[model samples]
Target: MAEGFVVKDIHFEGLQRVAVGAALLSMPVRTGDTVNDEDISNTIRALFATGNFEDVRVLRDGDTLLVQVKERPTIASITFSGNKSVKDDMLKQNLEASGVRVGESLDRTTIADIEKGLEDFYYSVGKYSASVKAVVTPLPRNRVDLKLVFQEGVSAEIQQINIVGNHAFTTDELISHFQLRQKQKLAGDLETLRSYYLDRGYARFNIDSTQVSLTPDKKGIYVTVNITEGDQYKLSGVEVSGNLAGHSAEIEQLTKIEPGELYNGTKVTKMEDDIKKLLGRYGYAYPRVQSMPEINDADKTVKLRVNVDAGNRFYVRK
Candidate 1:
């Protein structure tokens, strides 16, 4: 087939942020030039890569090439609400680097990414729950007013992190498991310690309280984790559910956990691997096995649940 025809004249539509003259200057094709699908396609792609237009359309009428474009919105003004930690000068510097200026054009996609960079500013300071959102109010003349709302929570300068109220395990051992207490790290500090306790077979372990102490001004967040390391429970039994292809009896036996013994945190990992291997022998690959412990307060025991999902069966033809 034919790629297309020669362009007698080129016209542009829906342009505001970019001057038609400048846009035409950036285009690969010009008036009175031969063009094809590949040529028109490359012209559009090259324009888009310049990061100006959101939509570009090429049409052929008789021998004329009509190029329609929807230019990205302009940033009429950039303001900040609830921003105390991040200085205005710092924001202006970064936003300019992102190609956003009050009197200039702004790529909406670039604006969105800039919002994340703003949030990362908090994350580096341990404000794990910091929120940064871009509130764009559309104005006249294809322009928008960008207001970056920042909620810089308690993760300022975490003065110090204290892990107290612990026995059986040394403070160094338990603290080492936590990814928190560093110069950086947000809410992950909580989860790291929580997982550490659970995986250590502390079935009844609980965080008495997670206390935060702070002084006046933008001082860092001081963290204190008060935990009650309750009695460790032994496993009563292990159960399996969720569409088992392998024998349930055999699956339960392979868990390698005996009754009336202290629950081994790594037992569930072995259970998942064993079931996956078991199904593989029967030509069932891509099997998923999930293990979760069911704690019983009445018996002070933990029952492990191993759920197997036999996914797509793969058969090998010899």
Candidate 2:
């Protein structure tokens, strides 16, 4: 057993889910590659950085290079208690989808990553000051039970949703359109704010950034969102091009996107729905209507191109 020994055979120890060949691919040295004190030091770093195992080290037996690994624990049961706003089953299901659930080998950074994941989940649902904790209670057969205890502190009531950088619409007007108010899921409200500006002719509108500040008593969350709203756009005109079984007049009658008005993507979608419904009324049951937009930045106007497929693309299963 020596560091200066020439490598003849390379073997792996303590691998469960990660195949030996897969881990070997990440190593800088193979069976014939040279090994030394400096090279071995870097080898340990790369092996751990691969994030497949908890502990990695090297040993020597005669001329054989032994790569020993202490595999991370496997989760047996994931349980949560004292959580209200974030349901127990929902949390477990999310953990399962996150690749850290039962029967799966845990990552070396699972605890830190899981903590951050839970914190983000809590903040999205208005629990601005929630407390979540996880512990690995050791079980039999190299398995561990993951016990997640949480106190979903108080549900933060939204005191205010402040918006900056809007010249087309007033603050109150924009706030009036949001559905997530004084409740959980501040994330949805932020998306609502984005869609509001994007649909209302601000072609390049975006939420530049957002900040949530907790109230003094930790029962309120103040949301401040910064935005960038570019040029506003109005509808220039519409073009109808589709052979909808010769029902162009009825589909033309369903065009509600008036020219010279601020383009509303939501309304355009509704117009598509209206065209589909009208087609259904005309005995063509399943119809597809698309109101695609072509924007002209110089004109600050958009043109709606409507296309419909009527009763021709449907087929029944045998």
Candidate 3:
């Protein structure tokens, strides 16, 4: 299993701008609990989701958990330069969608993303090679102003597709699976391809390298995907342990992975979800499922061990 400690009563110290109570409330886990890998993950995820913190860390001391965060500067105003066509507010809206906004933290990565977003936005408007720059000017009261400078360049279209290390599927077939067709916009196309594979049970498949090379004349972009397709494995069996010896029949029925069915990442995820639902239905809302996937590639099978921690089943309200 992936390794990470869960938070138990997050302590906030050295918080200046952000409210300590609000920050503590934003956390997913609390005291008197067993934190899983995903809980710690989502704790960091929740902080990022707030779009206020630049850095969020979880430190464990004995049993106590500490959540340290650095908040971002608030947005005072946004301005644009070298742009006669695109409105200033329109540019601000685009930046917001790209995770740049007022009252948000300004980081190096976010600043880079803002610049890339501006360039991509200009490219979408038939302006390739557009040099877009962003200047963050800090102001009083923890506020900062954003200035976007755009140098609109020539328009370019995608003309070719290339796939490497593809043995099980053809290049055309793989491209067909992707939502990004030829001549379509390049923006978000890579992510679309990634999601396409994930949605179709290739959860571990990754495009190791992607190159969208531009022509010498800046007329077209050649898209290339260098991928590593891991072996497609399936679930072999489901076994329940840890005080679940009595509920074997019910546990087997709840699992979504059926015999002879193609293994799906989504289905594997739903197994945990369904287990939780089953527990909730039985008034065991806090029941824990310790799921372990035993993989054997030679047999191309995965055995699951679901240990149910039925922690004091309680009565539900009417």
User: What lDDT tens digits, residue by residue, belong to model 1 across residues 1-318?
Assistant: 675788988777888668878888888999878898888888888788777887888878788788888877788889988877767888788778766788876776666688888876665455656688899999888888999988887656666778877887887786665544544343566666666766766777777887776556645667788888876787888878887775667776786666778776666676688788988887788988887778987878998887788888887689
Assess each prediction's global lDDT (C-alpha) against the native: 0.76, 0.78, 0.71
Best by lDDT: 2
* Residue 132 CA displacement from its true place in model 3, Å: 2.3
| lDDT: worst 10-residue window of model 3 | 177-186
Best prediction by TM-score: 2
Residue-by-residue lDDT tens digits, candidate 2, 1-318:
455657898888887767888888888877776687666777788888876678998877777888988777878888888888778778887787777778877775668788778877788677877777888787765678888888787778888888889778899998887754454357887878877876778766789998889889998878888989888888888777677888888777777555699987677777888888877776777786776778888879888888778866444569
Ranking under lDDT, best-scoring first? 2, 1, 3
Candidate with better lDDT, 2 vs 3? 2
Model 2 Cα shift for residue 141 (angstroms): 3.9
Candidate 3 lDDT, tens digit per residue, 97-159? Answer: 876776666765667777887887775554668888888887876678888888777677778
Predicted structure 2: lDDT: 0.78
Model 2 CA deviation exceeding 4 Å by range: 1-5, 37-42, 59-61, 96-99, 108-110, 179-185, 232-318
